[PDB]
Paper text:
While the Y221G mutation, which is positioned just two amino acids downstream of the inner β-barrel (star in Fig. 1e), prevents the prestem loop from moving away from the five-stranded sheet in domain 3, the second mutant leads to a block at later stages, namely, hindering the formation of the full transmembrane β-barrel. Due probably to stochastic difference in kinetics and steric constraints, only one of the heptamers is able to undergo quasipore formation with extension of the inner β-barrel, leaving just enough space for the second heptamer in the dimer to undergo progression to the post-prepore state. The density corresponding to the prestem loop partially disappears from the pocket between the subunits, as it becomes unstructured and flexible. First, the inner β-barrel, which will eventually form the transmembrane pore, elongates by incorporating 15 more residues from the prestem loop (c shown in yellow). Second, the protein undergoes a vertical collapse, which translates the extended inner β-barrel and the outer β-barrel 39 Å towards the target membrane.
Aerolysin is a major contributor to the pathogenicity of Aeromonas spp, which causes gastroenteritis, deep wound infections and sepsis in humans. It is a pore-forming toxin (PFT), which is secreted by the bacterium as a water-soluble protein, binds receptors on their target cell membrane and, following proteolytic activation, forms circular heptameric oligomers that insert into the plasma membrane thus permeabilizing it, potentially leading to cell death.
Numbering used by the authors:
A (entry chain H), B (entry chain N): 1 to 237, 261 to 424
C (entry chain E): 107 to 159
D (entry chain E): 319 to 371
Write the structure that this text describes.
Amino acid sequence: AEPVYPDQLRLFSLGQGVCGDKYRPVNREEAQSVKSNIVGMMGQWQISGLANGWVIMGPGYNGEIKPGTASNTWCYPTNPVTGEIPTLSALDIPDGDEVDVQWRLVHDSANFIKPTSYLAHYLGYAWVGGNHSQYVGEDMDVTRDGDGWVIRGNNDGGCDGYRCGDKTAIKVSNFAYNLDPDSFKHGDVTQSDRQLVKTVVGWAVNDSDTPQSGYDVTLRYDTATNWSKTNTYGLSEANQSWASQNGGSTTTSLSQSVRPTVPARSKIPVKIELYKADISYPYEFKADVSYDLTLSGFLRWGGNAWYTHPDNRPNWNHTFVIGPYKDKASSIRYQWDKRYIPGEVKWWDWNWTIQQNGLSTMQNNLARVLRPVRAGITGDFSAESQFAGNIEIGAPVPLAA
Amino acid sequence: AEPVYPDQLRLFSLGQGVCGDKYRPVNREEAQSVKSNIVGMMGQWQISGLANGWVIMGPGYNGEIKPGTASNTWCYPTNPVTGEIPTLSALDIPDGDEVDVQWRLVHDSANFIKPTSYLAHYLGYAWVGGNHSQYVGEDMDVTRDGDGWVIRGNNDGGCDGYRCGDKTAIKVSNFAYNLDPDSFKHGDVTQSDRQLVKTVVGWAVNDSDTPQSGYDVTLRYDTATNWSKTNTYGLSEANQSWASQNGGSTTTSLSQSVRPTVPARSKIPVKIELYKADISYPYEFKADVSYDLTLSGFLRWGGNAWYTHPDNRPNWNHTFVIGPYKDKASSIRYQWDKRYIPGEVKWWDWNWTIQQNGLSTMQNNLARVLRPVRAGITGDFSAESQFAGNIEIGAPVPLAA
Amino acid sequence: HDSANFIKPTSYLAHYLGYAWVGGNHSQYVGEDMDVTRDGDGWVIRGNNDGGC
Amino acid sequence: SGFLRWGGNAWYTHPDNRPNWNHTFVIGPYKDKASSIRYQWDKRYIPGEVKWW
């Protein structure tokens, strides 16, 4: 048939048939996804009209579904629903230095840290918000590590509840750029040093009345490192012996050559040079910002969507990747595919979060979280001992044939 | 919102609202950068109107910021400011030999050593200036090391203060050239010696009535060095044994070949020669000069911008790179990005230097330091055992098909 | 866990060295306020870090 | 492990400001200067080799 979206199912006490206005009765096929999952909607001894001659039994009957009829029919509105996070409008970030850009994203209060922290609560974390008031995720404070940013409200003054302080945190990890091909300014290029590696100088002549083809000359330079690792076995601590090894190696190589075409009856001077040293460019370009999200412990007991929520009480850490990826558990949009169908979630019960916070609640907030970040990156580039060189074909000297 | 530039913040005793003419009240967002940093502008028990229902508490309250109102409102002029070092006008250096050029840069008194040494003082160094008078950085004297230049005023005659002599120094390190593509004269090329490596002589003929393609002949020469390094383990000082190795190697290679196209019905003589030995060119070209700056100890106690200025008293060495690079701490322009926003400076408190010397003071002097050096480099080039060779296609002999 | 001939000593070292420390339920410098926990490999001792202060 | 109160010094070129420290001591025969205690103790009193740690 066609998968059902759990929170659209409804139970009616209409005896048998259809319900509401468009709510068709649930079939034996759907029962596969209904199994287990739906039990949260009924009591131990609560049985219910699956339909088509079937009744769902509750926990007291070990969750079995048997033939027969009841008066509590489960029905489903037979209408398509928004099974995805709504249109990610857009985010306009002003141009600036890469880290300056990071700051503006990080500090965009209600449009950034707000809904993020709201999820933390919805998700199942405990101390979400600073020492100021009773609002979820409000008054978070921000600091920075050279390799990331940390959101964590002030830990001073007033403090109550179970465990004083021990606040949860939102950390900004790595990030990347959807370097939009429509724009990219490469700036001036230089080197910052010198070191001669090797050169070659020579020439070729055409002692004929016809133009010739290539006078190929190549200058090449290779580097390599090796990695050996051998284990051997003699007398168990003998004659028969073992030796085994894991490698291996890596190399780099740089060539460069001329393919000059001397004109009839002439001499051509040729030079190739190879150096090594530092290089630098400046950017600048516009791109969509990809954003990594890290959440720290600890969990709110009794309000966790994580499957293992039957027990324990605290430090559950996890990261997400905010962008167009399918890196399993890190993809929030991917996770919606587990709301319906499989028990193979490999993460958390999103249906639980729906019945706790409301579908539209999170539905909206998730868009606030996931929408694209459009920005212009200013700044530059530098690198250590890279390679550099040049090739030239000098002017012809009218003397040969 | 939009980062604030610390030294533009002002406190007014106007109760509540706005200040001056355009000074808007500071928001809760800005408070993140205000935190810690701003404390230097107030006393232990000094509290102040953050605004929007918030008050900043001083050191006596452990630096917390709480809800409420005061009469000391912090405001900000809501106008964009020159958050960078001003236009680097230009510097006209006359053409001369590379080292001759270095001399002119080094000895350009008021336009070079002056503002540099002024920074040394502003920066936080102690004995800045020679034994002559009471002026900062005046009467510095210059000497030279084959690999760099040293600025250091005479150490004789009059001398007082804490520690006699022990002057600070300004050293000129490496430098590089923005070889502007608009000009580059390659001069005459020669070798300074000979040594035959290997040659090959031969020929090819066309015994048909049609022109042929390539008669490829290649002469190749390779060199290589190896690097082995193995550690092994027997009886802990046994049967089971370990061996591990780090590599690796490097090679150089030089080819060269002919791709001659013999005309129908003929004979072509071919020769390829390979030699090794010294080579030389002369330049000459114009370029922008990149300049490395090294400062020696020792620090002026009580007047240091370096974060660790709460204690100790002397030898703090550090280098800068004067040019378009992002090599972290060595980039003065990059450093301005830490004046505002992060506590993650990884260097010195530039805001401290502003409140001590004046913004416009340093603002101007930094340009005097960082402006481009335009110059023409005269001189030449030499190198040891490089490779050299030649290729020739001799005149055709009318005899084949 | 004995701590009387171990921590009440050690904690004085900490304080004497000049480390920031208070005990959840005590105004004393001595490590009276604390208990023993573990990370399997070794052990950790901490003064509650509960209650207001 | 933790933060320095204000004054104090276990192995640092102090005075300092208000940061952490996080280092160890070896209570044993292992003669290793940076964590010896007894060595450190026996040395300062002789030349002032080290700072106020």
